[PDB]
mmCIF file of C-alpha atoms and ligand atoms in Angstrom:
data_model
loop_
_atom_site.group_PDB
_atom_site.id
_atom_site.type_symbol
_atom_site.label_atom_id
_atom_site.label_comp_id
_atom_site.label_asym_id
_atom_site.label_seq_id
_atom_site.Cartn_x
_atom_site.Cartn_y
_atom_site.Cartn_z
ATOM 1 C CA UNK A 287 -112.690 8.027 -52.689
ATOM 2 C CA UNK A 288 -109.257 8.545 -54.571
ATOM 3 C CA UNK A 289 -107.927 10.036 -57.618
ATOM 4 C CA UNK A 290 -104.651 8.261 -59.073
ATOM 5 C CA UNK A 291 -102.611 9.866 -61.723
ATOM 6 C CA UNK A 292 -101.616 6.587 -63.628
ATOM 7 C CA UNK A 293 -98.606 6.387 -65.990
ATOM 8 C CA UNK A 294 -98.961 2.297 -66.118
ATOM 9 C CA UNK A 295 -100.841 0.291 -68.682
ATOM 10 C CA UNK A 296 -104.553 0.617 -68.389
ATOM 11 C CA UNK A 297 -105.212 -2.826 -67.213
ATOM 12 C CA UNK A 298 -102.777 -3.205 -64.757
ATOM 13 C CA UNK A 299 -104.515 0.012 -63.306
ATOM 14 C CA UNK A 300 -107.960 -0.997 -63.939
ATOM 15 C CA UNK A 301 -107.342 -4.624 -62.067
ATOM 16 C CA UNK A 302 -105.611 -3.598 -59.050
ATOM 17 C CA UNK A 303 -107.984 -0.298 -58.414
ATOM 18 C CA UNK A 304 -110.691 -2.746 -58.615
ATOM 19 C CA UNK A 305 -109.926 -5.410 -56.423
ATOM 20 C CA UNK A 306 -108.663 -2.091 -54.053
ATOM 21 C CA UNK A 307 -112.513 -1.502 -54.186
ATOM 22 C CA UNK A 308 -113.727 -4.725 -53.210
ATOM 23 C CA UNK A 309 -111.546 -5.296 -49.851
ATOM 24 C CA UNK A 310 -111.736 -1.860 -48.819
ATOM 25 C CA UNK A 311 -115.093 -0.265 -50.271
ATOM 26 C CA UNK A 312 -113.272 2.970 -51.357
ATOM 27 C CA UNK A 313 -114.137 4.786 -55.215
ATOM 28 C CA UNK A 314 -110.867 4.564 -57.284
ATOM 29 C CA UNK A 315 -111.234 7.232 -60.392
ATOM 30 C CA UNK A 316 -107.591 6.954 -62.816
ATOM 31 C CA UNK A 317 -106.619 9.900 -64.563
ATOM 32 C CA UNK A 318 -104.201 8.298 -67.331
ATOM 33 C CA UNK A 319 -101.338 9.803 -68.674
ATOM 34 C CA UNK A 320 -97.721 9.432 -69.779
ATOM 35 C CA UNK A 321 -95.466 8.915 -66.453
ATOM 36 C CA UNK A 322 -92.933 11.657 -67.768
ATOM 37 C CA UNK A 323 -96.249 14.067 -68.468
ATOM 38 C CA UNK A 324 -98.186 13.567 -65.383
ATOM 39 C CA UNK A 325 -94.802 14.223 -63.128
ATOM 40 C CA UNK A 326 -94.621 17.566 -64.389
ATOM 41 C CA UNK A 327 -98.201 17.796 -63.955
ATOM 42 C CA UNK A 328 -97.722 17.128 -60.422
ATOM 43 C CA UNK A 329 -94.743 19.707 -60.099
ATOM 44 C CA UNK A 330 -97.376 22.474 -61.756
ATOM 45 C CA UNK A 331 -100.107 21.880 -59.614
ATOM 46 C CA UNK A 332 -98.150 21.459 -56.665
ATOM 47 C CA UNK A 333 -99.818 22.033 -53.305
ATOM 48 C CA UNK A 334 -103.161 22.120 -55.454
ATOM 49 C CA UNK A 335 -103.122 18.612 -56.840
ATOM 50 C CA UNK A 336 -106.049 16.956 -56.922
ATOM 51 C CA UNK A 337 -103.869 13.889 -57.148
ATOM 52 C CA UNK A 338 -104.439 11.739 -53.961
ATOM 53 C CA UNK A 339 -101.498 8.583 -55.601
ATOM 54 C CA UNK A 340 -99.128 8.659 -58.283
ATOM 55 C CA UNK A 341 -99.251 5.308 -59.673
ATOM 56 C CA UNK A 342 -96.283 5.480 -62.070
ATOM 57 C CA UNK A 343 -94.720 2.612 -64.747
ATOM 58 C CA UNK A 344 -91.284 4.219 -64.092
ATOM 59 C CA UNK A 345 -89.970 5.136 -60.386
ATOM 60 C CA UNK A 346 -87.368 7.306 -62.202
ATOM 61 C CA UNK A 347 -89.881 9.950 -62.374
ATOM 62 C CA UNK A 348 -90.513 9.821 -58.386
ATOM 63 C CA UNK A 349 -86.704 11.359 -57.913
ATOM 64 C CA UNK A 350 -87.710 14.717 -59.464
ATOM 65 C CA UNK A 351 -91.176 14.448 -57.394
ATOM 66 C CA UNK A 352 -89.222 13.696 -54.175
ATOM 67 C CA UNK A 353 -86.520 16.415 -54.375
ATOM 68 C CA UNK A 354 -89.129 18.992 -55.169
ATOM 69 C CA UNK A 355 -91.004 18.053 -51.496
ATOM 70 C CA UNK A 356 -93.873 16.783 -53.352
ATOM 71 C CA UNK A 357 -94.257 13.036 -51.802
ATOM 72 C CA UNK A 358 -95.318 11.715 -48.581
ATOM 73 C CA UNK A 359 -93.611 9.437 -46.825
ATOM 74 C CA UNK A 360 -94.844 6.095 -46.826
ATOM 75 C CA UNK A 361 -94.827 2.981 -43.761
ATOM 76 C CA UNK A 362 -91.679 1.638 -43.247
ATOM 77 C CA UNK A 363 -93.988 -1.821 -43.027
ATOM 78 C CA UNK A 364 -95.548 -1.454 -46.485
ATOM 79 C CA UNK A 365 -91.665 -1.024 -48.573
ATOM 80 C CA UNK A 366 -90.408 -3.325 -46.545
ATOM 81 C CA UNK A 367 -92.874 -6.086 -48.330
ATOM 82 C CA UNK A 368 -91.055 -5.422 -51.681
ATOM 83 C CA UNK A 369 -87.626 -4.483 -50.588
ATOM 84 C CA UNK A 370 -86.234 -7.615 -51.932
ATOM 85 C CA UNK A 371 -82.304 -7.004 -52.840
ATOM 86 C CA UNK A 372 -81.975 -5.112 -55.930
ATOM 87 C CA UNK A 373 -85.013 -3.318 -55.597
ATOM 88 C CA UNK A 374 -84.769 0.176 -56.017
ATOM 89 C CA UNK A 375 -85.754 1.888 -52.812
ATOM 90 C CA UNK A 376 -86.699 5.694 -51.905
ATOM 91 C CA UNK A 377 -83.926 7.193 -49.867
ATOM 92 C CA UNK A 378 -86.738 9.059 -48.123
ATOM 93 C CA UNK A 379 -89.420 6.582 -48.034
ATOM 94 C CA UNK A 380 -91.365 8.332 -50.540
ATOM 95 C CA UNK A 381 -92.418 5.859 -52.733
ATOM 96 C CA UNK A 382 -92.303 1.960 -53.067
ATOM 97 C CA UNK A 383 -91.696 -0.295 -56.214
ATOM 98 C CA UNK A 384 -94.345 -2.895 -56.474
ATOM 99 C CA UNK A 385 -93.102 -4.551 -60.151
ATOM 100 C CA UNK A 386 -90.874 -4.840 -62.473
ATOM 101 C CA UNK A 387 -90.655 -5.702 -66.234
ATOM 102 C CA UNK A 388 -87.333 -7.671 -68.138
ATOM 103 C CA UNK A 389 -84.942 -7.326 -71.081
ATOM 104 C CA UNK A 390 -84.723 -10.639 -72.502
ATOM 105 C CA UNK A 391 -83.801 -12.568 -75.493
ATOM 106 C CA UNK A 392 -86.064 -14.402 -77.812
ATOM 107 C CA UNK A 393 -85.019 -17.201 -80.002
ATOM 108 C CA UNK A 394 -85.905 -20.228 -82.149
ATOM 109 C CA UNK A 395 -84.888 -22.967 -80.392
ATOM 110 C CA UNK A 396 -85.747 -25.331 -83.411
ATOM 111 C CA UNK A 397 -82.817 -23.099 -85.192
ATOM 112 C CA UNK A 398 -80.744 -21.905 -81.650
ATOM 113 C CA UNK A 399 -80.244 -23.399 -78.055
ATOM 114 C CA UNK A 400 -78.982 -21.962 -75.096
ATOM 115 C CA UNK A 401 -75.372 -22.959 -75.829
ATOM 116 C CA UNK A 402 -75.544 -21.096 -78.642
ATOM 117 C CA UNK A 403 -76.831 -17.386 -76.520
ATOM 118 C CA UNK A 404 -74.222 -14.610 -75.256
ATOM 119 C CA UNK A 405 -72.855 -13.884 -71.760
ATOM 120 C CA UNK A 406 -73.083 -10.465 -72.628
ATOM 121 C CA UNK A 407 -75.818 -8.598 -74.406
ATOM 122 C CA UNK A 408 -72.818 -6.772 -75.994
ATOM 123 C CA UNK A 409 -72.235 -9.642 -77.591
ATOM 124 C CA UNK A 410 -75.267 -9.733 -79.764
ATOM 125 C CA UNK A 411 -74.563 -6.727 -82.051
ATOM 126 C CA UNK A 412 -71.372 -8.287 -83.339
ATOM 127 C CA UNK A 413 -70.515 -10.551 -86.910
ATOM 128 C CA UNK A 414 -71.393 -13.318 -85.183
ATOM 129 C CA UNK A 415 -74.881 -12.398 -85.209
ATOM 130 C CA UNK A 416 -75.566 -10.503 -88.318
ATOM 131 C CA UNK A 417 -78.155 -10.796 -89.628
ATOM 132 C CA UNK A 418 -79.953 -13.214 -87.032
ATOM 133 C CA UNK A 419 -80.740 -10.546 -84.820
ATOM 134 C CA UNK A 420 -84.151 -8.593 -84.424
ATOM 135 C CA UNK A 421 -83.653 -5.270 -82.253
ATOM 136 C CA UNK A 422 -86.717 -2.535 -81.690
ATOM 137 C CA UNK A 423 -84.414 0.713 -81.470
ATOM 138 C CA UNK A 424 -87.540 3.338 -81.370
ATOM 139 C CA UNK A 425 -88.835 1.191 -78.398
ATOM 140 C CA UNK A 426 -89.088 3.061 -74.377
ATOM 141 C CA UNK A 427 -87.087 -0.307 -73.090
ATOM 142 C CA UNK A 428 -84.446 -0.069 -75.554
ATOM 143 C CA UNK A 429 -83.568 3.510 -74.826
ATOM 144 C CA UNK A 430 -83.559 2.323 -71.059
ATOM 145 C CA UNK A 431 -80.925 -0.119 -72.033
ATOM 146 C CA UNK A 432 -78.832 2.347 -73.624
ATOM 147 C CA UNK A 433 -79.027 4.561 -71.260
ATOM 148 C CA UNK A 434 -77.976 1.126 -68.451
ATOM 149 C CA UNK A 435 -75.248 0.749 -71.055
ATOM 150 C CA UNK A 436 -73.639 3.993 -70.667
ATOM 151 C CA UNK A 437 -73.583 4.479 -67.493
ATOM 152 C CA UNK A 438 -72.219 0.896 -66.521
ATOM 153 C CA UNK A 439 -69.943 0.712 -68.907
ATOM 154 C CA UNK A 440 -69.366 4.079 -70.533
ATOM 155 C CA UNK A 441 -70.315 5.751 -73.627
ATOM 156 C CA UNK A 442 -68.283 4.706 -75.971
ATOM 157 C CA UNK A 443 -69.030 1.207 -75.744
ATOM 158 C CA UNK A 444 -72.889 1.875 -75.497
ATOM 159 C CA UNK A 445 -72.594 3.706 -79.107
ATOM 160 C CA UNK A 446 -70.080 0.927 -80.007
ATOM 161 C CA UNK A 447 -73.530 -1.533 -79.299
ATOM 162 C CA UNK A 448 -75.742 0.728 -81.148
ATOM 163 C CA UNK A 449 -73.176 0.411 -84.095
ATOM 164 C CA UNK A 450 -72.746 -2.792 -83.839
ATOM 165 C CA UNK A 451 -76.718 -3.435 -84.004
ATOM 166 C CA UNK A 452 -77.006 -1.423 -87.036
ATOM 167 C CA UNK A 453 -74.282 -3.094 -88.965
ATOM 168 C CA UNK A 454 -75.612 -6.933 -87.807
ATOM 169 C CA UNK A 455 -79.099 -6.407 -86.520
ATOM 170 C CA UNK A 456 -82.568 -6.891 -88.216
ATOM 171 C CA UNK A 457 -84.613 -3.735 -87.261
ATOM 172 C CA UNK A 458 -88.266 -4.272 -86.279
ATOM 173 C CA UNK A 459 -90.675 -1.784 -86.072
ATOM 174 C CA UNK A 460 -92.144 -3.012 -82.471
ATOM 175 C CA UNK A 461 -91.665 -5.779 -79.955
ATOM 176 C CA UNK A 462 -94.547 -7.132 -81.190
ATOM 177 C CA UNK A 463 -93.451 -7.491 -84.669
ATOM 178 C CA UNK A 464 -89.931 -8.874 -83.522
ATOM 179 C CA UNK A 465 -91.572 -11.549 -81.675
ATOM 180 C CA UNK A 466 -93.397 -12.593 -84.943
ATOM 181 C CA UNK A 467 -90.413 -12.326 -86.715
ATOM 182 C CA UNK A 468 -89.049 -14.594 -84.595
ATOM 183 C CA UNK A 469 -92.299 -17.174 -84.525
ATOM 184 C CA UNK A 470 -92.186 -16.927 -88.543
ATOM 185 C CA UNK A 471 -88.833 -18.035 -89.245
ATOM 186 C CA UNK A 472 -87.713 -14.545 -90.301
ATOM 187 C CA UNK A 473 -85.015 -14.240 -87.444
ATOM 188 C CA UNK A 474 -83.897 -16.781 -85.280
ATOM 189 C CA UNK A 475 -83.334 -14.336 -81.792
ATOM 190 C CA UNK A 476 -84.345 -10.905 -81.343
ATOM 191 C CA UNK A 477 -84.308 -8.537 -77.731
ATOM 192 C CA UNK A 478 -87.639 -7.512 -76.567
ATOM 193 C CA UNK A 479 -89.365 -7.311 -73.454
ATOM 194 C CA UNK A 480 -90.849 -10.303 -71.438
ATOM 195 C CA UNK A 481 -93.934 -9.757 -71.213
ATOM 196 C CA UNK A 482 -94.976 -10.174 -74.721
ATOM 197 C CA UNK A 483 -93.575 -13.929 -74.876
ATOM 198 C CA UNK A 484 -94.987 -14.651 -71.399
ATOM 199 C CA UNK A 485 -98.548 -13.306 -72.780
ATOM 200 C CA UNK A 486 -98.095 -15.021 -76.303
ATOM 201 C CA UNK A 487 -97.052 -18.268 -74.180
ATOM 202 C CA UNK A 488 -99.950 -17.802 -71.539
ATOM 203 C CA UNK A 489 -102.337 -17.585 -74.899
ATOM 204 C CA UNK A 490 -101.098 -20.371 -77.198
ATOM 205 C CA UNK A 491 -99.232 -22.822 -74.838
ATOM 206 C CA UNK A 492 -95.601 -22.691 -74.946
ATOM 207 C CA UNK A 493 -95.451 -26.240 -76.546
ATOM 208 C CA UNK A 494 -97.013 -24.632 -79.413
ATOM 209 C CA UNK A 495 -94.391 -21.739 -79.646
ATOM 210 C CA UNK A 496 -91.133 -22.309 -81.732
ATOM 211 C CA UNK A 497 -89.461 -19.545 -79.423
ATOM 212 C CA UNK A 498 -87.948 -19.427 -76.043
ATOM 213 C CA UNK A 499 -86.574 -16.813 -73.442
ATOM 214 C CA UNK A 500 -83.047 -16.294 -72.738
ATOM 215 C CA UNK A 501 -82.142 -14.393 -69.900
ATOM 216 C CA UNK A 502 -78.590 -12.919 -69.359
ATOM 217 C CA UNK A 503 -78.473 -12.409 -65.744
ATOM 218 C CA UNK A 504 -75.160 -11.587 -63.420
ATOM 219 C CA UNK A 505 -75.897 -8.364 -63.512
ATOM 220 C CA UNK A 506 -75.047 -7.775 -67.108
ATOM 221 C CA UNK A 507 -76.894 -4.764 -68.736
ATOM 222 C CA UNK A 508 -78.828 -6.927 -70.933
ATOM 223 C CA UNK A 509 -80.271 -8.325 -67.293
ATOM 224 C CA UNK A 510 -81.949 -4.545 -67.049
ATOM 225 C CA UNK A 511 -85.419 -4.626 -65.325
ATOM 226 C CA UNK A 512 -87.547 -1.259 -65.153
ATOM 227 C CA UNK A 513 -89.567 -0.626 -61.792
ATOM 228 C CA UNK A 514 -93.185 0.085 -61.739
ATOM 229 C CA UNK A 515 -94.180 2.009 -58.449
ATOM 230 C CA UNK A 516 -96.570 4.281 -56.429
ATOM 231 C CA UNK A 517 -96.144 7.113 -54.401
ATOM 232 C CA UNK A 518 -98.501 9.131 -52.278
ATOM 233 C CA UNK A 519 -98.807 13.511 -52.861
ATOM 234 C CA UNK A 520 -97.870 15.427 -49.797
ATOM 235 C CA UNK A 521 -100.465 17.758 -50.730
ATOM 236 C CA UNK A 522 -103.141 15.418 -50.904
ATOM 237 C CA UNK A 523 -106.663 15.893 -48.381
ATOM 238 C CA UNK A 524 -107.094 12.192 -47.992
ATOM 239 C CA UNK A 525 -103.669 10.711 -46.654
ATOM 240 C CA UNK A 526 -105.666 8.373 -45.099
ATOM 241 C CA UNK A 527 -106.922 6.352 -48.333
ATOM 242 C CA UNK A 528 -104.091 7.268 -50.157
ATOM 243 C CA UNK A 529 -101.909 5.548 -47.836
ATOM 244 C CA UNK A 530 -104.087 2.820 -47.529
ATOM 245 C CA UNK A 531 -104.376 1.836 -51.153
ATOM 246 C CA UNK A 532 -100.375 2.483 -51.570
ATOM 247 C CA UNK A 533 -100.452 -0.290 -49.114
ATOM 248 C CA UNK A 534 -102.453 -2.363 -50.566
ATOM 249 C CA UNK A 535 -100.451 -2.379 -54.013
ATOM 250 C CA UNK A 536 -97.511 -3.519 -51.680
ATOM 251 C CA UNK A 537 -100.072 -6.480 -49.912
ATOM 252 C CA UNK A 538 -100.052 -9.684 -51.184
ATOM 253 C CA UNK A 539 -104.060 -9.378 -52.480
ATOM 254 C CA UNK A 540 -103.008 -6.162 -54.031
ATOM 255 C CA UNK A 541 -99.655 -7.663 -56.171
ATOM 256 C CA UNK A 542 -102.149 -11.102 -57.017
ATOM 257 C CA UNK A 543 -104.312 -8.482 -58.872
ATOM 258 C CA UNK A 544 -101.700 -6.832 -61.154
ATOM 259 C CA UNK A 545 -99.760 -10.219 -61.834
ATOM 260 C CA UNK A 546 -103.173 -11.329 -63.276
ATOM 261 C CA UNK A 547 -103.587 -8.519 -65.621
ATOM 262 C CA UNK A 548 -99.954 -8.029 -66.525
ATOM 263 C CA UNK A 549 -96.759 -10.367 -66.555
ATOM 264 C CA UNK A 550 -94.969 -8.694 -64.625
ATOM 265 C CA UNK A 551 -92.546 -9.476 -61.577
ATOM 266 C CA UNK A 552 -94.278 -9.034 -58.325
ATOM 267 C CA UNK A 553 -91.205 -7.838 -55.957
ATOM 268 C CA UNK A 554 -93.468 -9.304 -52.787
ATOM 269 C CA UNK A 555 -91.472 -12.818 -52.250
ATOM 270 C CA UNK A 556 -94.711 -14.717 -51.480
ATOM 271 C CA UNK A 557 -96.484 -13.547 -54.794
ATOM 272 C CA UNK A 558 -96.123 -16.062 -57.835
ATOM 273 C CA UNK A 559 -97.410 -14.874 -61.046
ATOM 274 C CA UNK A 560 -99.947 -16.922 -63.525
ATOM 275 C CA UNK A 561 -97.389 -16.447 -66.584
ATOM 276 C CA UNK A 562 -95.313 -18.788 -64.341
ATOM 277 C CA UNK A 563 -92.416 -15.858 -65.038
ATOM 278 C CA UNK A 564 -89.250 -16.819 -62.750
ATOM 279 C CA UNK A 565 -89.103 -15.315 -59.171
ATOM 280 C CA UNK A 566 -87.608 -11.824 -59.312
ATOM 281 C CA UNK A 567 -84.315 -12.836 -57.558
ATOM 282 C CA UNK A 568 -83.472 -15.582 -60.232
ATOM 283 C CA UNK A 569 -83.274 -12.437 -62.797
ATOM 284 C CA UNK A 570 -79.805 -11.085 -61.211
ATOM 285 C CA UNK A 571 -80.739 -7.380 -62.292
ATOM 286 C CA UNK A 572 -78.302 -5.212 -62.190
ATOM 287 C CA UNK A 573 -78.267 -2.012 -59.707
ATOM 288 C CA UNK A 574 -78.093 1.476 -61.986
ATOM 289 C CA UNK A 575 -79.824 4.583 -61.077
ATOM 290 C CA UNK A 576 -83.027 6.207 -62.315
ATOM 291 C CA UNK A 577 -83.383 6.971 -65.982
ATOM 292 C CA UNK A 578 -83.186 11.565 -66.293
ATOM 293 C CA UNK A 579 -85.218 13.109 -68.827
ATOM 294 C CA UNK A 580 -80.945 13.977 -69.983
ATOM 295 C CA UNK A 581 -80.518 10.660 -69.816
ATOM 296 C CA UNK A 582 -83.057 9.963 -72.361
ATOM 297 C CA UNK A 583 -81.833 12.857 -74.204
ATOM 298 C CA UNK A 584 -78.302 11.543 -74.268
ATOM 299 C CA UNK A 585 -79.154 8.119 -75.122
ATOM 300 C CA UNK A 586 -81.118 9.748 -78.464
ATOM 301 C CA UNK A 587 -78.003 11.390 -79.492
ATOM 302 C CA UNK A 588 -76.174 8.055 -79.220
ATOM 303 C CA UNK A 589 -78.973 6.360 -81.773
ATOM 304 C CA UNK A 590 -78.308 9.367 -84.387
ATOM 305 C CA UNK A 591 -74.880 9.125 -84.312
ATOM 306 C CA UNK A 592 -75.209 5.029 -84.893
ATOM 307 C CA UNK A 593 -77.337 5.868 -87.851
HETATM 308 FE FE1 FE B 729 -94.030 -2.275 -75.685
#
């Protein structure tokens, strides 16, 4: 049996340590956190962990865990399943990205079409858009896309967004709520996640939805995904299990499991998801590096200073 520190949702932990049991026979017992929280839990405890896997929903918190000698090196085999270009990969072989979740647009298409979206998600927080667009700025996945914003295309321009979004935008208190907002009439785009149209669509039919997806791609920051991963402890006292469900979240039973609980992108290339979301590839994510706790704190900054 295995304990797994798990920073990802619930039930994409749940499904995939349960069909884990059921080809292998091995005891899966979570202990659920915040990814951030249980990283520096794992720094504390150190060579005393009883953490076996660190199942995380952001691989930027494996580069603190990897620099501090704290990760195992996993099969060359097993991240080579997922290693599709673009895919963030451990420059040890310390961890593995298994998923990923999108930035996207939302709109109306009884009010918008496609000819009428952006090439840039720059473009959005401009007078061309006021106030037609929804925007979720306490939101995890919009201080990721800050943060993608700064660093590709420098500060000033990421604030200049953030400006721009509170002089034009429609502020919503969740993605959630944005997507109603949408749905209702309220606002005719907003930018959210994926997942929640791809669940809403998956529930109601996606005749029955007055919204769409619009997805930037080329590599523009609005294209940003965010990497779900897993990485094995160094110090744990059953390598053997550990290893072996790490490679199971990398097999193609293991990525069916968590595509059924959560629509998300499998990175396996042979793994098609029952939200009928778009192979991974088709997304054109851009390449930036992993999200620092100053990175968050920088990006926060930026917001106040927006207003
Ligand atoms: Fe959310």
């Amino acid at each position: 049996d295995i304990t797994v520190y798990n920073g990802q949702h619930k039930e994409a932990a749940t499904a995939v340590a349960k069909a884990f049991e059921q080809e292998t026979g091995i005891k899966v017992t979570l202990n659920s956190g915040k990814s951030e929280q249980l990283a520096g839990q794992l720094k504390e405890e150190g060579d005393k962990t009883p953490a076996d896997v660190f199942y995380t929903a952001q691989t930027a918190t494996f580069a603190d865990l990897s620099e501090a000698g704290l990760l195992a090196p996993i099969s060359e085999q097993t991240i080579q399943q997922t290693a599709q270009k673009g895919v963030p990969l451990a420059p040890k072989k310390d961890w593995i990205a298994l998923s990923g979740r999108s930035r996207v647009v939302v709109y109306d298409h009884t009010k918008l079409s496609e000819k009428d979206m952006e090439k840039s998600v720059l473009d959005y927080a401009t007078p061309k858009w006021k106030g037609k667009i929804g925007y979720v700025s306490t939101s995890g996945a919009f201080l990721e896309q800050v943060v993608a914003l700064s660093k590709m295309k420098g500060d000033k321009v990421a604030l200049n967004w953030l400006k721009g979004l509170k002089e034009n935008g429609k502020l919503y208190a969740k993605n959630s709520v944005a997507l109603q907002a949408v749905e209702n009439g309220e606002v005719p785009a907003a930018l959210i996640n994926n997942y929640y149209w791809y669940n809403l669509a998956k529930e109601k039919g996606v005749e029955n939805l007055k919204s769409r997806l619009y997805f930037v791609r080329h590599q523009d920051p609005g294209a940003l995904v965010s990497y779900s991963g897993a990485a094995v402890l160094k110090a744990s006292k059953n390598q053997a299990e550990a290893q072996k469900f790490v490679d199971f979240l990398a097999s193609k039973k293991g990525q069916e499991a968590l595509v059924a609980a959560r629509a998300e992108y499998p990175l396996r290339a042979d793994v098609v998801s029952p939200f009928n979301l778009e192979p991974y590839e088709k997304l054109e994510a851009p390449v930036v590096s992993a999200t620092t706790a100053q990175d968050k704190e920088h990006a926060i900054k930026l917001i106040e200073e927006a207003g």
